[PDB]
Design a binder for this molecule. Structure first.
Ligand SMILES: CC(=O)N[C@@H]1[C@@H](O)[C@@H](O)[C@@H](CO[C@@H]2O[C@H](CO)[C@H](O)[C@H](O)[C@H]2O)O[C@@H]1O
Ligand SMILES: OC[C@H]1O[C@@H](O)[C@H](O)[C@@H](O)[C@H]1O
Ligand SMILES: OC[C@H]1O[C@@H](O)[C@H](O)[C@@H](O)[C@H]1O
Ligand SMILES: OC[C@H]1O[C@@H](O)[C@H](O)[C@@H](O)[C@H]1O
Ligand SMILES: [Ca+2]
Ligand SMILES: [Ca+2]
Ligand SMILES: [Ca+2]
Ligand SMILES: [Ca+2]
Ligand SMILES: [Mn+2]
Ligand SMILES: [Mn+2]
Ligand SMILES: [Mn+2]
Ligand SMILES: [Mn+2]
Lengths: 232, 232, 232, 232
């Protein structure tokens, strides 16, 4: 078997173990702040520097992974609390889309909402152009911000949120669990054939965006990960 | 929103939140020891004392849940290292089956291997009478120790094992993530309609068993849990 | 350590984690209504169905606890707005006293006003037989509705009240902070030895009562709680 | 009645509602970071700009208050996680002690550990020169970091801690409740005559300090407060 595992209790701008793209910054408290509040159509992303091999061209085997992370989103005067954070998987050469308008694209898609990635978004603004639900929601995205499936959710300002994600390669199922502020959990699962949607080696990371009037604090507090690919 | 959440970092015999059944004992370090090393066909089970409402007969809604736990199995001189541990869900009046032979039944089924429960087993002995795979394995059981599905796994003597489970009510998916000694993860997921398999009120817990020749130390070290049922 | 914690933002009938006694009811809005407006000497109580271990006879240790809740009392035609609500603690076999007259007993004591419980009352009627102050008030009750101590308070019809109670086992101090509708706080603290007044296992909850002419809407809207007993 | 009440979900150095002293900085995420990680004997404090009238020389009455806050301390390399945060009350003209050495002084006392203030410390280092318990502890201090009383407590790096404090006027009791990462709650209470120990007008606030080798992230995330003084 081939395993990739890491853990971040804190983040440091200097550490090369992570790629910083766009407006991302690292606060003195070790928190990764994805977007710049004083910028229009801001976009910031972070990827685990080491590309992870999710499937073998020799066997056809796809890896399973268990990952958990905690983030925080807080409102600011005077802007709509937008746009949200998305935990994504993409080609290792992934970079913020050219001419990104941020906002509802969440830093991973073009204006039409399309891009090459698979992710779990924590959306805090209803974009009708991307067919978003009416309330805050968590969604499974496959090459588009027009979610394959979504689930009602509530983004509480200044609340630490914990997420646990399990991908089981045999059933090709991606299961998510979000632990809210009131103590309630919110789950969402979807079958997604990663090998069919993504290349052999990829990068995992987070992205967040904003617009002219849509802005809020997007923070990544921690992140643990373990992927295992059967090589036999 | 109806939620049940608890977190055991250790245990005590006087903790009312825990129902002890069979040969269960509590070690001075807070660990629960499920089987008696000196008894033939030993059986021990521990349960969260409070019955949990997993689905509504009024709305048809089914709860989602996130639960994590860590156990440890250790060989002893010089019995066969058997039989294993099973995280189960069963009717609130669940009790060790009458005339339990322990062993491959894992304390949750009858001689034929049937019973009323849903669970994730960590099997260390291949019982041909229950169609077990040839090696240790993690299984998803529904009313029977003859697993609906299993995955190859390896139980390391004296190794602390971490497990995270996610049940998504919408897709009825029960996904398990097992973190091994060497940091490798093993996963298994299966669609299981709890509403169709179990009554509205149930109890969650752990069970382990041995036989005359098959014995080993079965320890439950910690357990956190959160179930949420959408109501009104 | 042994901890019991929970958080209710609303309530629903059927939740096995709650014991309903008497005339209690759950409204469509998740609120718990303690008394029946058409019944003479009405009494309704709600208890967390999980017994809480407040002290150990083995170690002699006593638990500490933090709890918060919000309630609302609202007048009705043509009865006197009575009798009030009491947050209480009693033996786990606690039931509404047999042949209760409700009224000023607040559903936890006998006709003389005696009982086996400890609690914080929110009194809206002056019962001279129990030496009540002449106006509305918050009181600390130890085995009697004839409060060991009281502080002038005022129950505003329809006002949502917030309460926070801290019990420090070391000093045996029970402090209460009541946040009125107009933003003012009212506090009352009393040294109460729970190890000396209650058994090792108890149940927490609320009770409200009325009489023939004294009636009113008694609502419990939320309730969070955390008690910890050191077992080391 | 005279009541003061406020609430901060986020902080800003451009806001007049707060005084900033020393190395205190406000991160882009809204958190207040009390100590500078790059300075020796660092010290930073903040105070609610408006002095709170806690007692009257005309009537002798003393105010009761309920205040809760959340903070965060996180380790860093290669320094000892020190020294801690202290929520204090002091003369309205309080200032960082002249020639402060930070460290165990928590930024409120002199080298001897004496000063004019009442506070609740969250101590993460054992200074023998101040008779500190051998482990992390929460203490009630009255004009000295040589705590009047302490209770064992575990400071978890990167964990958000919630605190609730109630000062009962009549009993002159100050009781505190702290929420741990494991879920357990910790409390400590002590009788403190604010009238005798502090002036009529005071300021409430937080302070944290570090040394040459002792440094860590000291964050203040939110703070609500309500005090009521009877004027009659
Ligand atoms: C009545 C009878 O035929 N007896 C048989 C024994 O001969 C032998 O087959 C045992 C095997 O029990 C299993 O033992 C292992 C360990 O060595 C595990 O504990 C299995 O779960 C057991 O079933 O069964 C009867 O006693
Ligand atoms: O007001 C806020 C919003 O503004 C829109 O212009 C943008 O497309 C949305 O994604 C969101 O940022
Ligand atoms: O008029 C109202 C009141 O009536 C009394 O008879 C009763 O004892 C009081 O507790 C209160 O209900
Ligand atoms: O190692 C760290 C510590 O070092 C001491 O010298 C200092 O007095 C303490 O307050 C703390 O800073
Ligand atoms: Ca959107
Ligand atoms: Ca078996
Ligand atoms: Ca009365
Ligand atoms: Ca110290
Ligand atoms: Mn969306
Ligand atoms: Mn099996
Ligand atoms: Mn009274
Ligand atoms: Mn100290």
């Amino acid at each position: 078997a081939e395993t990739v595992s890491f853990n971040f209790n804190s983040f440091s701008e200097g550490n090369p173990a992570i790629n910083f793209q766009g407006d991302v910054t690292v606060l003195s408290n070790g928190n990764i702040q994805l977007t710049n509040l004083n910028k229009v159509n801001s976009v910031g992303r972070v990827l685990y520097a080491m590309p992870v091999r999710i499937w073998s061209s020799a066997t056809g085997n796809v890896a399973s992974f268990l990952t958990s992370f905690s983030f925080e989103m807080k409102d600011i005067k005077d802007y709509d609390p937008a746009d949200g954070i998305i935990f994504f998987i993409a080609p290792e050469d992934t970079q913020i889309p050219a001419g990104s308008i941020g906002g509802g694209t969440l830093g991973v898609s073009d204006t039409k909402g399309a891009g090459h990635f698979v992710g779990v978004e924590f959306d805090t603004y209803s974009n009708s152009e991307y067919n978003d639900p009416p309330t805050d929601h968590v969604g499974i995205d496959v090459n588009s911000v027009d979610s394959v499936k979504t689930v009602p959710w509530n983004s509480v300002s200044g609340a630490v949120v914990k997420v646990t994600v399990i991908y089981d390669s045999s059933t090709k199922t991606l299961s998510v669990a979000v632990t809210n502020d009131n103590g309630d959990i919110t789950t969402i699962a979807q079958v997604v054939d990663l090998k069919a949607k993504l290349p052999e080696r990829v990068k995992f990371g987070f992205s967040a965006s904003g617009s002219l009037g849509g802005r809020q604090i997007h923070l990544i507090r921690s992140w643990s990960f373990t992927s295992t690919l059967i090589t036999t």
